[PDB]
Amino acid sequence: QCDVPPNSRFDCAPDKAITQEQCEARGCCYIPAKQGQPWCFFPPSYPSYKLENLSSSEMGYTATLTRTTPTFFPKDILTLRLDVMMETENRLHFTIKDPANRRYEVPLSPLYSVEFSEEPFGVIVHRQLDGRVLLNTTVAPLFFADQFLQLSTSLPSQYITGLAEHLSPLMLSTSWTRITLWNRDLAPTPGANLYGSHPFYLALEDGGSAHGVFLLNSNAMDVVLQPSPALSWRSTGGILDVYIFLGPEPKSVVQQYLDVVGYPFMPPYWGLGFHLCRWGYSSTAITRQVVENMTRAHFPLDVQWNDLDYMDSRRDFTFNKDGFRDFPAMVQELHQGGRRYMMIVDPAISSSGPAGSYRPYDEGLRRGVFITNETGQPLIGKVWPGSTAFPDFTNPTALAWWEDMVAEFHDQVPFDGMWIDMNEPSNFIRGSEDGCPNNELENPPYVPGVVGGTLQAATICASSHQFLSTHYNLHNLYGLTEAIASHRALVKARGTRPFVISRSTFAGHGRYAGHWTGDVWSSWEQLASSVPEILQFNLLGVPLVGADVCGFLGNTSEELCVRWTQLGAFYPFMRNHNSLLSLPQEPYSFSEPAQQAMRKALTLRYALLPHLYTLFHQAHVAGETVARPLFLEFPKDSSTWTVDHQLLWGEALLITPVLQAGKAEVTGYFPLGTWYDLQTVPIREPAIHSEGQWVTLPAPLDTINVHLRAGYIIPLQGPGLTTTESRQQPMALAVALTKGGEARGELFWDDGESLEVLERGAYTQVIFLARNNTIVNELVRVTSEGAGLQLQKVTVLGVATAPQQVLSNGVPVSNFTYSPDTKVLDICVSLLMGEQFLVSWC
Numbered sequence: 024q025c026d027v028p029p030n031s032r033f034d035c036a037p038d039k040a041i042t043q044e045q046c047e048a049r050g051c052c053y054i055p056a057k058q059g060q061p062w063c064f065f066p067p068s069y070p071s072y073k074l075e076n077l078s079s080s081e082m083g084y085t086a087t088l089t090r091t092t093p094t095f096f097p098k099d100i101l102t103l104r105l106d107v108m109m110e111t112e113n114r115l116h117f118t119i120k121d122p123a124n125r126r127y128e129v130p131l132s133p134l135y136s137v138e139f140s141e142e143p144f145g146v147i148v149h150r151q152l153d154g155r156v157l158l159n160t161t162v163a164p165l166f167f168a169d170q171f172l173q174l175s176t177s178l179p180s181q182y183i184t185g186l187a188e189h190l191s192p193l194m195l196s197t198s199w200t201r202i203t204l205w206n207r208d209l210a211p212t213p214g215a216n217l218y219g220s221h222p223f224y225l226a227l228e229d230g231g232s233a234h235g236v237f238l239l240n241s242n243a244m245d246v247v248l249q250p251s252p253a254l255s256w257r258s259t260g261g262i263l264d265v266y267i268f269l270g271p272e273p274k275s276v277v278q279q280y281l282d283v284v285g286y287p288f289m290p291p292y293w294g295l296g297f298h299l300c301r302w303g304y305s306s307t308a309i310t311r312q313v314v315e316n317m318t319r320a321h322f323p324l325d326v327q328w329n330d331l332d333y334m335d336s337r338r339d340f341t342f343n344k345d346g347f348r349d350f351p352a353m354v355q356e357l358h359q360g361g362r363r364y365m366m367i368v369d370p371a372i373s374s375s376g377p378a379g380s381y382r383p384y385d386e387g388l389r390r391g392v393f394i395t396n397e398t399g400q401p402l403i404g405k406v407w408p409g410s411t412a413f414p415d416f417t418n419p420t421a422l423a424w425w426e427d428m429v430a431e432f433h434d435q436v437p438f439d440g441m442w443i444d445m446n447e448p449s450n451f452i453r454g455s456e457d458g459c460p461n462n463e464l465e466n467p468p469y470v471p472g473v474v475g476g477t478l479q480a481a482t483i484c485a486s487s488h489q490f491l492s493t494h495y496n497l498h499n500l501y502g503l504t505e506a507i508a509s510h511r512a513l514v515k516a517r518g519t520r521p522f523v524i525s526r527s528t529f530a531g532h533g534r535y536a537g538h539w540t541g542d543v544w545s546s547w548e549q550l551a552s553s554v555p556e557i558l559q560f561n562l563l564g565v566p567l568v569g570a571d572v573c574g575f576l577g578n579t580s581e582e583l584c585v586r587w588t589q590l591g592a593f594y595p596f597m598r599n600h601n602s603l604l605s606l607p608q609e610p611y612s613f614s615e616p617a618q619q620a621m622r623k624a625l626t627l628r629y630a631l632l633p634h635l636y637t638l639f640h641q642a643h644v645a646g647e648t649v650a651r652p653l654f655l656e657f658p659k660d661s662s663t664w665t666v667d668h669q670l671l672w673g674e675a676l677l678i679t680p681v682l683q684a685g686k687a688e689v690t691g692y693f694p695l696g697t698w699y700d701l702q703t704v705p706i707r708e709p710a711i712h713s714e715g716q717w718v719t720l721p722a723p724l725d726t727i728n729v730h731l732r733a734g735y736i737i738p739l740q741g742p743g744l745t746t747t748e749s750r751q752q753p754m755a756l757a758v759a760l761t762k763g764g765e766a767r768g769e770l771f772w773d774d775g776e777s778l779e780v781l782e783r784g785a786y787t788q789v790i791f792l793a794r795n796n797t798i799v800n801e802l803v804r805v806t807s808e809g810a811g812l813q814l815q816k817v818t819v820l821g822v823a824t825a826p827q828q829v830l831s832n833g834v835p836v837s838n839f840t841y842s843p844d845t846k847v848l849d850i851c852v853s854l855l856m857g858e859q860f861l862v863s864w865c
């Protein structure tokens with residue numbers, strides 16, 4: 024019975040160090056490892072639940088689950104209800120609940136077949152097409168106690184991604200890895216629970232099919248991977264609410280997941296521009312000098328930010344009357360030059376001022392908006408202003424108070440978005456100024472592998488009261504609930520698309536806000552680690568994501584700042600942010616050659632903004648990723664599965680960054696096909712003809728490698744120091760022909776910031792097609808927004824022979840150049856995106 028292969032052993036002492044005698048007393052097997060692998064593990068006969076009275080309804084399947092022998096955890100729930108819902112051809116949904124008591128729940132032919140094991144209970148999910156076993160929860164016992172749920176499954180391969188937020192390769196290690204989901208303020212470092220929690224994984228299958236699993240549970244949890252391969256969800260509360268997404272393509276799995284949690288929000292066009300911030304712009308005069316210095320050196324800047332500097336004594340919804348006396352005028356002036364303005368907002372509200380002196384606290388107290396403690400008073404912690412209370416964003420009155428504080432502050436200073444920090448929520452002391460009570464929420468029977476070994480570390484008491492539940496159940500939603508409240512507040516205050524950037528996140532955050540990866544070191548290792556983390560957030564439906572460009576903590580170097588700007592110009596959210604005690608790292612603060620390299624990176628990003636905005640439209644309407652790993656686009660090429668130091672924008676733009684000091688070249692993977700060097704497009708081989716292989720590319724310090732996939736057309740737009748300027752420029756097409764002379768692309772265009780654009784039809788959508796030495800547009804929708812768009816240049820890659828003639832609408836063109844070396848045809852035209860054209864050559 025104890026003859027269990029080592030990799031298939033499931034831990035029977037997850038709760039503590041255990042002796043052979045205690046292990047065998049639990050009904051478990053004790054076999055020491057010969058060198059991690061559990062010594063105490065479940066025999067196949069270990070008591071689980073038994074399935075009884077399975078019945079079929081129009082809803083799907085229902086059953087009773089009964090445990091007869093108690094586990095070693097307190098408060099087993101001996102009778103459960105199983106509900107299995109076949110919701111779509113791609114989505115299976117099952118829940119395990121207590122039929123006698125409402126437990127906390129998070130507020131939010133088919134491709135599969137399902138069968139059940141009776142004793143021990145398990146759910147088995149097959150892919151119907153090839154019979155692969157995707158889920159099998161029979162592999163280990165089901166635990167369902169008041170503060171301990173455990174559900175296990177086999178995995179179909181060693182390849183699994185998800186379970187943010189952690190600093191790790193994109194593909195998670197199955198070598199006895201414990202992944203802890205408990206939102207925590209900590210500088211990103213491996214093996215730690217960071218700012219957000221996304222209980223979703225995508226598992227690859229031999230052949231390139233994939234499935235996804237979402238556990239809709241917001242409690243502190245560990246997810247344990249083992250090399251059999253297998254996975255165990257271990258949660259401290261709530262219910263088992265499981266979604267399986269059948270794909271079969273990894274891009275379809277992500278879309279199906281986003282059909283449950285929400286499609287990404289559509290950012291304003293200006294949010295895709297360059298953002299510049301630091302802690303230490305300590306007056307309006309210094310802040311204005313940043314914009315002046317960027318402009319003087321020809322660096323694009325859409326959005327100027329301030330950190331805590333603007334505040335009066337580090338209090339939200341205030342501004343100091345020293346350095347920031349003319350704060351309103353500074354922001355009106357940024358607007359007059361065509362820029363936007365963002366500033367930090369903390370959740371915690373100063374509680375120590377004299378009564379009637381600080382409206383956010385005084386009004387919060389009147390309306391009962393704050394998280395309360397055991398004696399029904401506001402829980403007091405310590406953050407920047409000193410003593411603070413913590414708003415409860417699950418309370419409908421707190422949402423109304425937050426909308427009012429934001430609208431009142433906006434009437435003083437017309438900010439364009441909110442940077443919401445410290446929303447784990449982060450606490451400089453443990454729990455509260457008054458400590459925490461001694462109860463089973465503060466001291467639970469199973470504590471996941473959190474930094475500091477307590478749920479209270481760097482946050483508030485777990486037994487504190489919110490409107491919907493205790494903090495114990497809601498902690499991992501705190502940031503998400505503040506992002507919702509802030510998205511609503513900004514819609515109401517400004518009447519245009521909101522722009523919220525949040526530290527802490529939970530599954531479905533991307534429906535409301537973006538994310539930055541937090542307090543990353545200015546190091547080559549954190550530069551490199553940023554690529555998998557940005558890709559991971561795109562797979563989780565938070566495509567508006569980036570890292571602080573050049574790093575946050577410590578001092579950047581010139582070389583690191585060049586490489587980081589080059590890669591960071593391909594973050595969907597691009598901000599350079601810097602800590603208080605650091606050397607300056609604005610683009611204008613470096614040597615002339617470093618400035619030229621950083622200016623080229625920013626110029627290329629601005630030229631691509633119509634394309635990046637179109638990719639955001641596809642995320643918003645169809646659950647697509649913006650930045651995506653090669654394995655999402657080429658899943659049938661197993662060589663792509665471990666690549667996470669390259670990225671795609673959409674289907675067609677491959678970015679191969681240098682991520683190490685002292686390198687003048689880089690080796691990247693090129694899937695089968697032709698890849699054109701984007702340096703051959705007016706803004707080293709001209710084309711890589713790949714069989715699916717690794718290629719060494721020249722990569723001097725002034726260069727980042729970017730390749731355009733054959734078969735794709737990219738819209739570009741002329742230059743500007745802001746999107747206010749760039750959006751008025753003529754456009755261009757880059758047309759990457761296949762060997763057979765074909766290519767396709769698209770452009771989505773609207774006014775860049777209105778609400779309900781898609782509902783109201785206030786947009787333009789154009790498809791571009793190349794075939795047989797002709798390029799045409801196909802007008803899906805044309806409205807006022809895009810009818811004035813001017814096309815001035817058409818650059819055609821892979822043109823084998825110099826044309827005799829180039830026609831635009833049947834008339835010879837005024838000017839074109841053909842390069843026989845690069846096989847580029849560059850065509851000057853005067854056409855309109857929104858009117859049918861036909862360009863031809865021979």
Ligand SMILES: *[C@@H]1O[C@H](CO)[C@@H](O[C@@H]2O[C@H](CO)[C@@H](O[C@@H]3O[C@H](CO)[C@@H](O)[C@H](O)[C@@H]3O)[C@H](O)[C@H]2NC(C)=O)[C@H](O)[C@H]1NC(C)=O
Pocket residue numbers: 067142143147156159160161162
């Ligand atoms: C889902 O996972 C469960 C548990 O790992 C799998 O059930 C187990 O299947 C093994 C191998 O077939 C069974 O062992 C076999 O049992 C027969 C009858 O005693 C014996 O003659 C063979 O020599 C062999 O050892 C094992 O009994 C069974 N375990 C349980 C708990 O039922 C199951 O196969 C998986 N389902 C799928 C579709 O993969």
Ligand SMILES: *[C@@H]1O[C@H](CO)[C@@H](O[C@@H]2O[C@H](CO)[C@@H](O[C@@H]3O[C@H](CO)[C@@H](O)[C@H](O)[C@@H]3O)[C@H](O)[C@H]2NC(C)=O)[C@H](O)[C@H]1NC(C)=O
Pocket residue numbers: 396397398399400401402403457458
């Ligand atoms: C729930 O939160 C409230 C705050 O909203 C806690 O109130 C705090 O209670 C402690 C005593 O338990 C007060 O300390 C006292 O302060 C005075 C000076 O002002 C001093 O003379 C006393 O020796 C004592 O230190 C503390 O002031 C008070 N905080 C505030 C902001 O009034 C309450 O204790 C919390 N309840 C639990 C069970 O944790």
Ligand SMILES: *[C@@H]1O[C@H](CO[C@@H]2O[C@@H](C)[C@@H](O)[C@@H](O)[C@@H]2O)[C@@H](O[C@@H]2O[C@H](CO)[C@@H](O)[C@H](O)[C@H]2NC(C)=O)[C@H](O)[C@H]1NC(C)=O
Pocket residue numbers: 075076087089
């Ligand atoms: C499994 O179900 C049986 C039968 O329950 C009945 O049929 C169902 C479809 C539904 O209409 C129920 O409300 C019915 O009671 C349960 O066995 C019965 O248990 C009750 C209560 O102890 C008893 O009065 C009956 O004599 C039993 N009937 C038979 C035919 O055995 C059984 O308890 C259920 N199992 C579990 C573990 O819940």
Ligand SMILES: *[C@@H]1O[C@H](CO)[C@@H](O[C@@H]2O[C@H](CO)[C@@H](O)[C@H](O)[C@H]2NC(C)=O)[C@H](O)[C@H]1NC(C)=O
Pocket residue numbers: 309310312313316609
């Ligand atoms: C904007 O750039 C100006 C000009 O480089 C900076 O001011 C200079 O900074 C040096 C130190 O590098 C001072 O010692 C000089 O007195 C300044 N020169 C001039 C012409 O004023 C300024 O610090 C920059 N501001 C910011 C916020 O980056």
Ligand SMILES: *[C@@H]1O[C@H](CO[C@@H]2O[C@@H](C)[C@@H](O)[C@@H](O)[C@@H]2O)[C@@H](O)[C@H](O)[C@H]1NC(C)=O
Pocket residue numbers: 577578604605606
């Ligand atoms: C970051 O740099 C700060 C200032 O460093 C000084 O100036 C730079 C240009 C170098 O010449 C350096 O050797 C000088 O000391 C430091 O005060 C600060 O501690 C640095 N931070 C870290 C964490 O190393």
Ligand SMILES: OC[C@@]1(CCc2ccccc2)NC[C@H](O)[C@@H](O)[C@@H]1O
Pocket residue numbers: 302330331367444445526541542600601602603
């Ligand atoms: O608002 C201040 C700030 C940095 C605090 C800090 C503490 C210790 C050391 C360094 C910085 N809060 C944390 C944010 O993630 C960061 O972007 C922001 O600038």
Ligand SMILES: [Cl-]
Pocket residue numbers: 126127491492493
């Ligand atoms: Cl509850």
Ligand SMILES: [Cl-]
Pocket residue numbers: 285286534
């Ligand atoms: Cl939605």
Ligand SMILES: [Cl-]
Pocket residue numbers: 490491
């Ligand atoms: Cl309620």
Ligand SMILES: [Cl-]
Pocket residue numbers: 696697733761762
């Ligand atoms: Cl090709």
Ligand SMILES: [Cl-]
Pocket residue numbers: 831851852853854
């Ligand atoms: Cl023309």
